[PDB]
Design a protein around this motif. Sequence first.
Motif, PDB file in Angstrom:
ATOM      1  N   UNK A 135      16.512  12.430  46.508  1.00  0.00           N
ATOM      2  CA  UNK A 135      16.232  12.923  47.727  1.00  0.00           C
ATOM      3  C   UNK A 135      16.266  14.386  47.044  1.00  0.00           C
ATOM      4  N   UNK A 136      17.071  15.066  46.181  1.00  0.00           N
ATOM      5  CA  UNK A 136      16.792  16.287  44.717  1.00  0.00           C
ATOM      6  C   UNK A 136      15.431  17.001  44.633  1.00  0.00           C
ATOM      7  N   UNK A 137      14.785  15.308  44.112  1.00  0.00           N
ATOM      8  CA  UNK A 137      13.161  15.892  43.850  1.00  0.00           C
ATOM      9  C   UNK A 137      12.633  15.672  45.050  1.00  0.00           C
ATOM     10  N   UNK A 138      12.960  15.597  46.565  1.00  0.00           N
ATOM     11  CA  UNK A 138      11.607  16.199  47.040  1.00  0.00           C
ATOM     12  C   UNK A 138      12.665  17.222  48.190  1.00  0.00           C
ATOM     13  N   UNK A 139      13.308  17.555  48.037  1.00  0.00           N
ATOM     14  CA  UNK A 139      14.076  18.990  49.376  1.00  0.00           C
ATOM     15  C   UNK A 139      13.838  20.101  48.471  1.00  0.00           C
ATOM     16  N   UNK A 140      14.156  21.273  49.055  1.00  0.00           N
ATOM     17  CA  UNK A 140      13.792  22.645  48.163  1.00  0.00           C
ATOM     18  C   UNK A 140      15.118  23.284  48.761  1.00  0.00           C
ATOM     19  N   UNK A 141      15.963  23.142  50.017  1.00  0.00           N
ATOM     20  CA  UNK A 141      17.552  23.355  50.195  1.00  0.00           C
ATOM     21  C   UNK A 141      18.486  23.279  49.289  1.00  0.00           C
TER      22      UNK A 141
END
Length: 458
Positions: A135-141
């Motif tokens: 998830x961390x690799x796929x989000x910017x928030x």
Amino acid sequence: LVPRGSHMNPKRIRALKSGKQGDGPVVYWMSRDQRAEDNWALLFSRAIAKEANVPVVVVFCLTDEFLEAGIRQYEFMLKGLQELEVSLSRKKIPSFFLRGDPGEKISRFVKDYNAGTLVTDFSPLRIKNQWIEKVISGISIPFFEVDAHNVVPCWEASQKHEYAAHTFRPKLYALLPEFLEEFPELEPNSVTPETLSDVLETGVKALLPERALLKNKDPLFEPWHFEPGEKAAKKVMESFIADRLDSYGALRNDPTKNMLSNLSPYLHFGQISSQRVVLEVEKAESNPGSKKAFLDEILIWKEISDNFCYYNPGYDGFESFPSWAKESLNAHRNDVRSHIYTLEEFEAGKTHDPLWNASQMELLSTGKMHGYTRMYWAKKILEWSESPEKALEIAICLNDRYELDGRDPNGYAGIAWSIGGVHDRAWGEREVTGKIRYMSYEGCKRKFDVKLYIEKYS
Ligand SMILES: Cc1cc2nc3c(=O)[nH]c(=O)nc-3n(C[C@H](O)[C@H](O)[C@H](O)COP(=O)(O)OP(=O)(O)OC[C@H]3O[C@@H](n4cnc5c(N)ncnc54)[C@H](O)[C@@H]3O)c2cc1C
């Protein structure tokens, strides 16, 4: 930031990822704590949303790994979620159930729904850390986690692995004044911003070929022992307090007696808060000794299990055993075992030990082995396996497949206690098992009515 006077202790929350805040809803990615009441992660998510003037929404991922357990756990979980959907809708909180693994599904949801902030609850298990990384690799928030499962946040209770209950206990008890507190009511959203039945149908169809069956083709599992969901969980807590707690100190180690709380399936899925259970038990007047014994289990042994998994990456492997135990088991690795059973023989309760087999039948048929015989059971897997590594593999396999409360830090830590002496001391040295505490058949016969237990599960 949360609003002033939100009654949220900031030590319950940890940043996973800094990012840039979006302007849409706060998303609570619910995983471990499948309830709407007494849920610090949901409460924190609601409070951040309030401060940002947006709604809170809940998302839950129905993951690809459901096919590693059975119908027994899938149905228990999904029936709970069906009730949870309703509870959340009454708070004007929408819930979205995403089919797939979190990396892809949560990332896309965040993008598609313009999420502002992502919050999850806390688990120390490897699979949850795998999901967080993707998830961390796929989000910017920004991405936070909240310990909604433990009374004292796992990273606050101790800064390290605790080798014994007696070193963890003083640390934990010293923090209850701070962290053991009533919960605020969850504020509804100001306005309301494939069914689970279909999913359940489709999933059961995929699990049906692996269902546990008697030679008669009729299923082993009895689903009437534990009704799922938040409301049932509260009634099981209430019945424990009313009817079983007074006798718990005396009878908790008697598998012929139904005197345990029977809360573990609910606690594992987070359908009830252990902090809630502790508040209610602390308020009760019950027989001396019982409250002490119960609180030691649900506070110290439960929270030391999270401590174990959080601070030992290798919590499911031999390497996490204490040095004394690794050296002892190594010294006896080449001792001839009295018996060696296959995983299939263990699974089917086909050993030469009728108490072992009855313990396995209780697991097969109810999904919840009595806690006293779980110790006996795991220790005999060590005794009748080629190596300690194989014993761990077997015990974890069977625990995770057949326990309703399985796939849980309490299980990995309990199996490590049983096989590897984690959170135990050395005992008298024996062949095969070395100095690992031994639990003999004849000792059990002296302790409780073994013949009755066997009759119950035969
Ligand atoms: C080999 C082995 C495997 C186990 N597998 C699991 C497992 O998969 N999942 C699981 O939740 N527990 C497991 N336990 C711990 C324990 O056996 C169960 O939690 C307990 O039997 C649950 O029944 P209850 O809720 O009626 O227990 P209660 O005796 O009424 O205690 C209430 C709660 O306290 C906690 N608790 C109680 N005993 C322990 C313990 N020894 N360690 C940690 N927490 C405890 C549990 O959360 C439990 O639900 C295992 C223990 C062993 C030795």
